Assembly symmetry: C2
Homo-oligomer: 397 residues x 2
């Protein structure tokens, strides 16, 4: 039984306010969770509640969402069993009463949702991934790391160690390649300062050449050892054949949001042509919402979904999106937001669900690195029972 | 009693390997600590042990330091009482047998040192700052925030910092800093400058200019330069090795602190610098003192500097770090608890700085979780303290 719930305002990796919640149980269980925040939010994402007080953080305060936790949510949830995740989440969903969590705030709700799962794992004496996924939680994710950013139209250029035999090796290959890329950029007189996700933004096809060169320089085989993924996020500058040229030219394994978030017909066309060649990920298209994913499955749109906890607002609804995707033969790529925190929940979440892929940033900034560190702790704990799939994560192909 | 000790190789904020250690106790206490790593390491720092296997992380692995913990250190420390910090640290110091901890590695030793203190706090049911400092741990630090850099441009000085000396709480200090940081960001955006960040979360656009830019950002954020937000800077002069020049910057701008303005081995130069400027500015020894009581003692006797930058991994143990802090205080010197440019998700320095009531912290700009995690922990600590908390701001500077 949950005995107390407390929220506070802390800062994310961009120095912007976000919500942190703590849950206490009768047995002495403790869980603390922090909610990340996007900058390129899709228009159909769950409501992130901001104060709009221009005298605090330019109106980016989350004191209201925090008070919604400390008041209404605390009253509604205290007394529930900490292990009753679905009841806890549905209770908050009903309490809000709006489809997009706009009354209480998705950031208020998710903070409690995650802190509850953590408190439950704590009081059971289980690591988070074991509690969330059960005895067969064992698959470590093949990570796509955002090393080059976009001047440039495409938003994220990623390396993905599909040839690694463990997560540890995947992390080392990524780090070595990142630092090779860093040296490469330094030669060409580019800045080695980093964007929000830890990657570089030097001054659409050029980054593909740069990635291949960096991979080769680090002593790895492009395609076999390290492949390329990218997120167009085309909603920000709103063609299929240009994408397909890139795909056939370069060792690309995944492409995300290659078309606008509301262009359902164009997506279906895209998927028909390229669905056999590459992973096609919907991000702004699906917004971690089962109602949107269901539509795409019926239309044969995409073959993958980017899973973002705060796009939907509860751990339960996130489980439901991941499982719906799996049953449709879609991969579920568990994802960070561009505004991250010291919270590492997504690492445990992706192993718990055996999703097989993660998108949690480049090889710099602790807001990304902490996730990779946790994944390594998880792999160590799993020992011989662990599994890293690499290219075999792509059951959608 | 400590029953188990385990170490592993994890990654820092630059994507470089570092040591993480865990300590388990008989009562079921648990502690986990991670060791930071510097880029501009002073030559007299304790030894950071690296593998040198160029087939792994370009030779930056720390598997040896990790194995040193899992083997030798674990055998020497397991069975010791977890609350016996001084004995635990001395046991490791003697076990290594070398003055610079070059045999086992300072990174191996510090990882266990800090994890022990955490495991002790955990089994006692105490927050870390409470365990480390006792019932009068209550002072939140005035933070100096590295928002502009110069350590690839025409600027020789390494860190350009804002410091909310006019805030009434740490929460306010953090907000003032973040608002100013974001004001600064828009300003660089206006001038066609990049908004990408360096290792510590500050901007690196393309010596006087950063001071003028900082003053402008402070003003645009709606704060008063000097009274509300002052300027501090770290030249790190050693990395590129004058008093009247420095005194021009100090007299021209609302500067409250300057760090390593001279070379790490120029004690005579430092002495005359302090003679000139010691009355109107904080003078911080970083590479000069390397968190080492032997170096600080020499500085104190010669009348060199009036402040020391406190870095745990510069000396290798929590105990020796406590000793540097107390020696500094007793000499009328301030102790600025500090991060390294290579940080982790570990937030020990936040609890350490409150535990010792040091009054100042240097833990980075207002971006990157490697910095922000510390500011978050300080806010958690301030909320916990409640009415018993104290933020000193400009009054942290008892050396002036
Ligand atoms: Cl920086
Ligand atoms: Mg996207
Ligand atoms: Mg320094």
């Amino acid at each position: 039984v949950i005995t107390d719930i407390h929220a506070r305002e802390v800062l994310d990796s961009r120095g912007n306010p976000t919500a942190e919640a703590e849950v206490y149980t009768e047995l002495g269980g403790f869980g603390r969770a922090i909610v990340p925040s996007g900058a390129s939010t899709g228009e159909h994402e769950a409501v992130e509640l901001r104060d709009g007080d221009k005298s605090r953080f330019g109106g980016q305060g989350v004191l209201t969402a925090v008070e919604n936790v400390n008041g209404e949510i605390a009253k509604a949830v205290i007394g529930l069993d900490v292990t009753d995740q679905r009841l806890i989440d549905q209770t908050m969903i009903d309490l809000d009463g709006t489809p997009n969590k706009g009354r209480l705030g998705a950031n208020a709700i998710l903070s409690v949702s995650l802190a509850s799962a953590r408190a439950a794992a704590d009081e059971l004496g289980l690591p988070l991934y074991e509690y969330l996924g059960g005895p067969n939680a064992h698959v470590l994710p093949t990570p796509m790391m955002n090393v080059i950013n976009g001047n440039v139209d495409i938003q994220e250029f990623m390396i993905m160690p599909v040839g690694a035999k463990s997560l540890h090796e995947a992390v080392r290959m990524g780090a070595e390649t990142f630092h090779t890329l860093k040296g490469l950029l330094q030669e060409r007189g580019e800045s080695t300062a980093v964007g929000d996700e830890g990657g570089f933004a030097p001054n659409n096809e050029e980054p593909f050449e740069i990635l291949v060169e960096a991979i080769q320089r680090a002593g790895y085989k492009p395609g076999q050892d390290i492949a390329i993924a990218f997120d167009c996020a085309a909603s920000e500058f709103y063609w299929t054949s240009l994408i397909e040229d890139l795909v056939d030219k370069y060792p690309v394994i995944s492409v995300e949001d290659p078309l606008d978030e509301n262009d359902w017909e164009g997506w279906k066309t895209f998927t028909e042509r390229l669905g056999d060649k590459v992973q096609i990920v919907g991000d702004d298209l699906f917004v971690t919402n089962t109602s949107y994913l269901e539509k795409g499955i019926k239309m044969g749109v995409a073959n993958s979904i980017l899973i973002k906890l705060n796009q939907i607002g509860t751990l339960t609804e996130t489980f439901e999106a991941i499982e719906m995707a799996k049953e449709a033969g879609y991969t579920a790529v568990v994802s960070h937001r561009s505004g991250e925190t010291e919270d590492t929940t997504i690492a445990d979440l992706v192993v718990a669900t055996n999703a097989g892929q993660i998108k949690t940033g480049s090889m710099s900034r602790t807001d990304r690195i902490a996730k990779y560190n946790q994944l390594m702790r998880i792999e160590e704990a799993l020992g011989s029972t662990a599994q890293y799939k690499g290219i075999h994560s792509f059951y959608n192909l």
